[PDB]
Design a protein around this nucleic acid. Structure first.
Ligand SMILES: Nc1ncnc2c1ncn2[C@@H]1O[C@H](COP(=O)(O)OP(=O)(O)OP(=O)(O)O)[C@@H](O)[C@H]1O
Ligand SMILES: Nc1nc2c(ncn2[C@@H]2O[C@H](COP(=O)(O)OP(=O)(O)O)[C@@H](O)[C@H]2O)c(=O)[nH]1
Ligand SMILES: [K+]
Ligand SMILES: [Mg+2]
Ligand SMILES: [Mg+2]
Ligand SMILES: [Mg+2]
Ligand SMILES: [Mg+2]
Ligand SMILES: [Mg+2]
Ligand SMILES: [Mg+2]
Lengths: 51, 101, 161, 65, 349, 201
RNA sequence: AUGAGGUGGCAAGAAAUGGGCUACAUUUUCUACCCCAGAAAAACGAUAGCCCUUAUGAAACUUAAGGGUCGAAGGUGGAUUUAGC
C-alpha cells in the first residue's frame, strides 16, 4: 500500500518522537495506553471519593 | 463513622483497589497483549484472579458522599440528586442556578 | 495550586525562519506530518509528556533540534522515492513528458520528416509553455485560467487551431 | 523521563520480551504523572517477574537475559 | 431555425440558431447515447432540433481541419453539470456520421462500472471480468449505427470463442459483431476484438474512425462492483474498461477521439466537481494527456432567446404567462441560463 | 406564535402596489395609509411573486408532502404536471385536426378543472345528515380524495407521477374512482335526504 | 441478631397488558452524491434466532459493537384511543 519511502519516514518519525517503532496489533497496543494513563484506582477522584 | 455499612464497604473497596492498583496494572498488562507466550498469559490470568476480590476496580460504586445514595449521583459534585438540589436551591453552591431558556 | 494543564508547552516556529534547503524542508515536513501547517508555514510542537513545565519545554526544544538535524541528514532509503512520494509534481521524467515526447515522435513519423531528436523537440518554446501549463494545473490552483493555458499550449503543440 | 529504554539493559535485545518491554517503556514515557522512580519501579517489577518465570520462558523457547 | 440542416456547412453565423436532425438520421445514428430527457423531448415533439453552440462549432472546425496522418487527437468536452456536453458530443457524432466515419460511440461509460449482476471472470483472461449484458447491449446499437462499414472490415487473426468455434482471418467484422450479439457469453470478447480491429484498421487507412466516449472519467474512477468475497473491483479489471483505455491511448491515427466529462452518474465525486483533473483524477488526466479541453457553459442571451423561441413555437410552454417577458426573465433567473435546468423547468410549464 | 397579535400577514401582489392612487377609493386609501404603521410578518418561504405561482398546486404539494419532505413533494408535483402535458401532446398529435381543437394541453388548466369536477357539492355531518359544504371544505375534500386515491394500494409498483396524471386526466374527463367517490357521497346524501330536518342550522 | 462479614445463587415465561422502536415499501430499497444519476422491485421486512470476532471487565451465553449465517411474522391494522394551533 504505502511506498517504502513513506513507511521508513513514518518509522523514523516515530523513533524521533518516542512513539512505538515496531509494528503492533490493536490488542497489544492496549499496553501503551494502560501505562500512559494512571490506573482508575490511583486517580484522586477514585481513591479519595469520600471525605 | 460513615453514613452506612454500604458506604463503609465501598470505602474498604476503594482503599483495597488503591493498594493493589499497581500490581493489578502490572499483571493485567501481560494478559492484555498478544506478544508474550500463551502459557505466560495463562499464569498471569490465574495470578490476577488470585488477587483479592475487593481489589477489582469494577466493584467500586460511586455513592453520594453525604447520604450514600447508590444511584443518581452527579460525578462532578459527588452528591445525590436530592442533596445537590437541597444545596443548590438554598444557594450554597457557587454559580449553579435554576435554568430557564 | 496544582493544575495538570499547566505542564503543556507549545513551540511554534516558521520553517522559513530556519536554515533549510528544499530537500531538508520537505523531509522535515514529511517527518512532522500534521504538526506543520502549510498555510502559515508554521511547525507547532505540543509537549505534555513530562510532568513539569521546564521538562516539557526542554523536550520541545530537543524535539526541534533532533528534527532539524535529522532533516538535514540524508538517508539511503530516500533514493527509493515513488513518484507519488513527492508533495510537488515534477514535469521532468513525468508521464506528461513521456506522452508528449511520444506524440511528437509519432507526428514527425507521420510527416515522414524524421529529422528530429528528443532534446531538440523538448527544447522548443512550445514545450516550455506546455510544461508551464502542466505544472500550473498539477501544483497550482485548478481553474479555467489554467485550463485555457493548457488548451492553448496543447493546441500549438498538436498543430490544430 | 522519556528515554527509559536505557533501563532495559537486563532484558533480551530481541524477542517477545523485548517487544513487550518496548511497549511498556513507551507507555511509561508517555505517562506524565508517574515519577521517574515509579517508572523505574515498574520496569524493575517486570524484570523480577520475568526472572522468576524464567522456567516458563525457557519451556516456551523465549531466550531470557 | 436554420435553413442549413447540414452538420458540416453550418458555421458561426448559425450560432444560437437551430439545426434539425431527421428521424431517419436519429434511428441510424443514435440508437443510444442521447440524454434521456432529450430523447423524451424528441418523442414528444416529433423533432430533434439542436442549437448550434460555440463549443460544438469549435470542435467541428477542429475535426474538419484535422490531418489524419498525425496520431488521433483527444478533445475533451468539459464544463459544468447539464451544460450540453452530451448533446455537443451528439452533434459532433451526427456530423461525422454524415461525413461517413465509423463512429465508435460509448453512450455512457458510467453504466459499465455499477449495478452489473452478470459480472463474471473473463474466460479468455482470468485476471479480468466480463460484463456480457452491457457488452451485448452496446454491440447491438453499434451494429445499428455502423452496419454499412461493418462488412468491409477484414479481421486479421483467428479468434476462438470455444475449443470448437472460431472466426478466421479475412472474415468480415460483422461476423464477430454477430457472434458477440448472439452468444452473450462472448459479447465482451467480441467488443474487445472490435475495438482492436477498429483501432488498427484506422491506422491502416481502411476508414476514418471517430471514438466518442461520454463520461470518460469513469475509465479511472473507482467502481462500485464487488467480487464474490464482497471486495471492490478496480476499473482496469473490467475487460470493457481495459479495452476502452487501450482505445483512448493515442497510439494510432486515421481518426479522432472526443470524450465528454460528466459528473452525473460518476462514482465517488462531489456534485460541484466540474474541473478536468478533479473529475478524471490524476491517473485519468495523465492517461488522456495531452488533450484539448473544450468548455461548454450556460446559454448566452441569444442562445436563451433561441431556446425559448423553440419552446414557444412547439407550444411546450403552455403556461398562460410564459410568453410574457416577465416569465422569460423568471425562467432566465431560475435556470441561470443552464440548459438542463431550463429544460427541466419548462418541462412542467 | 412568536409573532405578536399586532403583526399582519404579508400581501404579496405586485399589481396591488402598482395600482394608481386615483383608482383607489377612500377606504382603500385609508387601508394603504394604515398599513404603513403596522408590522408585517416575514413572507413565508413557500409563496413568492413569481407569475408561475399557483396556490392550488402549492396546497396540493403541501398535502402530498410526507414528513416535511417538501423537495420530494415538489418533485412529484412537477413530474405529474410534465406527464400530463406529455400525454396531452401525444394525444394531440395522434388526433385528427378536428379533435385537436378539443384536446387541451395546458396542465394547469387540466389540474384545476379536474379538481373542480372532483369537488363535492353536499356533504354529510353527524347531527348523519346531508348538509351544505363551504367552499374551503369542498376544495380540501377534492384534494384529499385525489391524493388518497393515488396512494391506494390497489396500484402495484406504479409511480405517483404516472398514477396522479392518469387520475387527473380521468377526473378532467369526468371519470375515475374520484368521481365515483363524489357520486357515492351525493347518493348517500340523497338517501339521507329525509333526515335533513335534523339539522338545526 | 430483625445486626455485621464472606462464598454462591434468581432475573425464566403458562398468559396477559402499557409504552417505545423497526416495519409492512414505489413519496419505497441499494449504490454515488448529499438532492438534475444508475440499478431493485415478490422483493420489502428483524436491533429477532445461530456461529465467529472485537470493546470493557478478575470473570461476557449474560453487556455492547462488528462480521458472518437466516430472509422470519406482517401487507396500514375493530370497537376504542393518544398528541399536536
Ligand atoms: N446544445 C443544446 N441544444 C439543445 N438542447 C440542449 C443543448 N445543450 C443542452 N440542452 C438541453 O439540456 C439537456 C442536455 O444537457 P446534457 O445532457 O448535455 O448535460 P451535460 O451538462 O453535458 O452533463 P450532465 O447533465 O450529465 O452533467 C437537454 O434537456 C437539452 O434540451
Ligand atoms: N476470446 C477472444 N478474445 C480475443 C481474442 N483476440 C482478442 N480478443 C479480445 O481482445 C483482448 C486481447 O487484446 P490484445 O490487444 O491482444 O491485448 P490484451 O488484452 O492485453 O491481451 C481479449 O481479452 C479479448 O477481449 C481471441 O482470439 N479470443
Ligand atoms: K397500528
Ligand atoms: Mg458499576
Ligand atoms: Mg450531459
Ligand atoms: Mg441479617
Ligand atoms: Mg442480526
Ligand atoms: Mg478479554
Ligand atoms: Mg431481502
Amino acid at each position: 500500500s504505502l511506498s517504502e519511502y513513506a513507511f521508513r519516514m513514518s518509522r523514523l518519525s516515530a523513533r524521533l518522537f518516542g512513539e512505538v517503532t515496531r509494528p503492533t496489533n490493536s490488542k497489544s497496543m492496549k499496553v501503551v495506553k494502560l501505562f500512559s494513563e494512571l490506573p482508575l484506582a490511583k486517580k484522586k477522584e477514585t481513591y479519595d471519593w469520600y471525605p | 463513622h460513615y453514613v452506612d455499612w454500604r458506604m463503609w464497604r465501598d470505602v474498604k473497596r476503594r482503599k483495597m483497589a488503591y493498594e493493589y492498583a499497581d500490581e493489578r496494572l502490572r499483571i493485567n498488562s501481560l494478559r492484555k497483549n498478544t506478544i508474550l507466550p500463551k502459557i505466560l498469559q495463562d499464569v498471569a490470568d490465574e495470578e490476577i484472579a488470585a488477587l483479592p476480590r475487593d481489589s477489582c476496580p469494577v466493584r467500586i460504586r460511586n455513592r453520594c458522599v453525604m447520604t450514600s445514595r447508590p444511584r443518581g449521583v452527579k460525578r462532578r459534585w459527588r452528591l445525590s440528586r436530592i442533596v445537590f438540589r437541597h444545596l443548590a436551591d438554598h444557594g450554597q453552591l457557587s454559580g449553579i442556578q435554576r435554568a430557564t431558556w | 495550586v496544582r493544575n495538570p494543564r499547566a505542564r503543556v508547552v507549545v513551540l511554534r516556529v516558521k520553517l522559513s525562519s530556519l536554515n533549510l534547503d528544499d530537500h531538508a524542508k520537505k523531509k522535515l515536513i514529511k517527518l512532522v506530518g500534521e504538526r506543520y501547517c502549510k498555510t502559515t508555514d508554521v511547525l507547532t510542537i505540543k509537549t505534555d509528556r513530562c510532568p513539569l513545565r521546564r521538562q516539557n519545554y526542554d523536550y520541545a526544544v530537543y524535539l526541534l533540534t533532533v528534527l532539524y538535524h535529522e532533516s538535514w541528514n540524508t538517508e539511503e532509503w530516500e533514493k527509493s522515492k515513488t513518484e507519488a512520494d513527492m508533495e510537488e509534481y515534477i514535469w521532468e521524467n513525468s508521464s506528461s513528458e513521456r506522452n508528449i515526447l511520444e506524440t511528437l515522435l509519432q507526428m514527425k513519423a507521420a510527416e515522414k520528416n524524421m529529422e528530429i531528436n528528443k532534446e531538440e523537440l523538448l527544447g522548443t518554446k512550445e514545450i516550455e509553455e506546455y510544461k508551464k501549463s502542466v505544472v500550473s494545473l498539477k501544483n497550482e490552483e485548478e481553474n479555467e485560467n489554467s485550463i485555457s493555458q493548457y488548451k492553448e499550449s496543447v493546441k500549438r503543440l498538436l498543430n490544430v487551431t | 523521563h522519556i528515554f527509559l529504554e536505557k533501563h532495559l539493559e537486563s532484558f533480551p535485545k530481541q524477542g517477545p520480551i523485548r517487544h513487550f518491554m518496548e511497549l511498556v517503556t513507551c507507555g511509561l514515557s508517555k505517562n506524565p504523572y508517574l515519577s521517574v522512580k515509579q517508572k523505574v519501579e515498574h520496569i524493575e517489577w517486570f524484570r523480577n517477574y520475568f526472572n522468576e518465570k524464567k522456567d516458563i520462558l525457557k519451556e516456551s523457547n523465549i531466550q531470557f537475559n | 431555425r436554420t435553413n442549413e440542416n447540414d452538420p458540416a456547412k453550418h458555421g458561426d453565423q448559425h450560432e444560437g440558431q437551430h439545426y434539425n436532425i431527421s428521424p431517419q438520421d436519429l434511428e441510424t445514428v443514435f440508437p443510444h447515447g442521447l440524454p434521456p430527457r432529450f430523447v423524451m423531448q424528441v418523442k414528444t415533439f416529433s423533432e430533434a432540433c439542436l442549437m448550434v453552440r460555440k463549443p460544438a462549432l469549435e470542435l467541428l472546425h477542429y475535426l474538419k481541419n484535422t490531418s489524419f496522418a498525425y496520431p488521433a487527437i483527444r478533445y475533451l468536452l468539459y464544463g459544468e453539470k447539464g451544460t450540453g456536453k452530451t448533446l455537443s458530443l451528439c452533434h459532433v457524432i451526427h456530423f461525422c456520421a454524415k461525413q461517413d466515419w465509423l463512429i465508435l460511440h460509448i453512450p455512457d461509460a458510467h453504466l459499465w462500472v455499477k449495478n452489473c449482476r452478470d459480472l463474471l471472470q473473463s474466460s479468455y483472461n482470468k485476471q479480468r471480468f466480463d460484463q456480457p449484458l452491457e457488452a451485448s447491449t452496446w454491440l447491438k446499437n453499434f451494429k445499428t449505427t455502423n452496419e454499412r462499414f461493418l462488412n468491409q472490415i477484414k479481421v486479421q487473426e483467428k479468434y476462438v470463442w470455444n475449443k470448437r468455434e472460431s472466426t478466421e482471418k479475412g472474415s468480415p467484422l460483422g461476423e464477430v459483431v454477430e457472434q458477440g450479439i448472439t452468444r452473450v457469453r462472448n459479447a465482451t470478447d467480441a467488443v474487445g476484438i472490435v475495438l482492436k480491429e477498429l483501432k488498427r484498421q484506422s491506422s491502416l487507412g481502411m476508414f476514418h474512425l471517430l471514438v466518442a466516449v461520454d463520461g470518460i472519467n469513469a475509465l479511472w474512477g473507482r467502481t462500485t462492483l464487488k467480487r464474490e468475497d464482497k471486495s471492490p473491483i478496480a476499473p482496469e479489471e473490467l475487460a470493457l474498461v481495459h479495452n476502452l483505455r487501450k482505445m483512448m491511448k493515442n497510439d494510432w491515427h486515421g481518426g479522432a477521439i472526443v470524450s465528454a466529462l460528466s459528473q452525473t452518474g460518476s462514482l465517488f465525486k462531489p456534485r460541484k466537481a466540474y474541473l478536468p483533473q478533479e473529475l478524471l483524477g490524476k491517473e485519468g488526466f495523465d492517461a488522456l494527456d495531452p488533450f484539448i479541453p473544450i468548455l461548454v457553459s450556460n446559454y448566452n442571451p441569444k442562445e436563451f432567446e433561441s431556446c425559448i423561441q423553440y419552446y414557444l413555437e412547439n407550444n411546450w410552454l403552455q403556461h398562460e404567462k410564459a410568453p410574457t417577458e416577465e416569465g422569460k426573465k423568471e425562467l432566465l433567473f431560475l435556470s441561470n441560463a443552464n440548459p438542463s435546468l431550463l429544460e427541466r423547468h419548462c418541462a412542467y410549464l | 406564535s412568536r409573532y405578536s397579535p399586532e403583526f399582519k400577514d404579508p400581501l404579496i401582489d405586485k399589481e396591488y402596489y402598482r395600482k394608481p392612487v386615483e383608482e383607489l377609493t377612500e377606504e382603500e386609501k385609508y387601508v394603504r395609509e394604515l398599513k404603513k404603521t403596522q408590522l408585517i410578518k416575514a413572507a413565508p418561504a413557500g409563496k413568492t411573486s413569481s407569475v408561475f405561482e399557483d396556490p392550488v398546486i402549492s396546497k396540493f404539494t403541501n398535502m402530498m408532502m410526507i414528513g416535511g419532505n417538501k423537495v420530494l413533494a415538489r418533485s412529484l408535483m412537477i413530474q405529474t404536471l410534465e406527464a400530463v402535458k406529455r400525454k396531452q401532446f401525444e394525444k394531440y398529435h395522434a388526433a385528427s385536426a378536428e379533435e385537436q381543437a378539443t384536446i387541451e394541453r395546458n396542465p394547469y388548466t387540466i389540474f384545476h378543472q379536474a379538481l373542480k369536477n372532483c369537488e363535492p357539492m353536499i356533504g354529510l355531518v353527524p347531527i348523519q345528515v346531508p348538509v351544505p359544504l363551504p367552499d374551503r371544505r369542498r376544495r380540501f375534500l377534492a384534494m384529499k380524495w385525489m391524493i388518497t386515491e393515488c396512494r391506494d394500494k390497489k396500484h402495484q409498483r406504479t409511480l405517483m407521477p404516472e398514477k396522479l396524471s392518469h387520475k387527473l386526466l380521468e377526473a378532467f374527463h369526468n371519470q375515475g374512482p374520484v368521481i365515483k367517490r363524489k357520486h357515492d357521497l351525493h347518493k348517500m346524501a340523497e338517501a339521507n335526504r329525509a333526515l335533513a330536518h335534523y339539522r338545526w342550522w
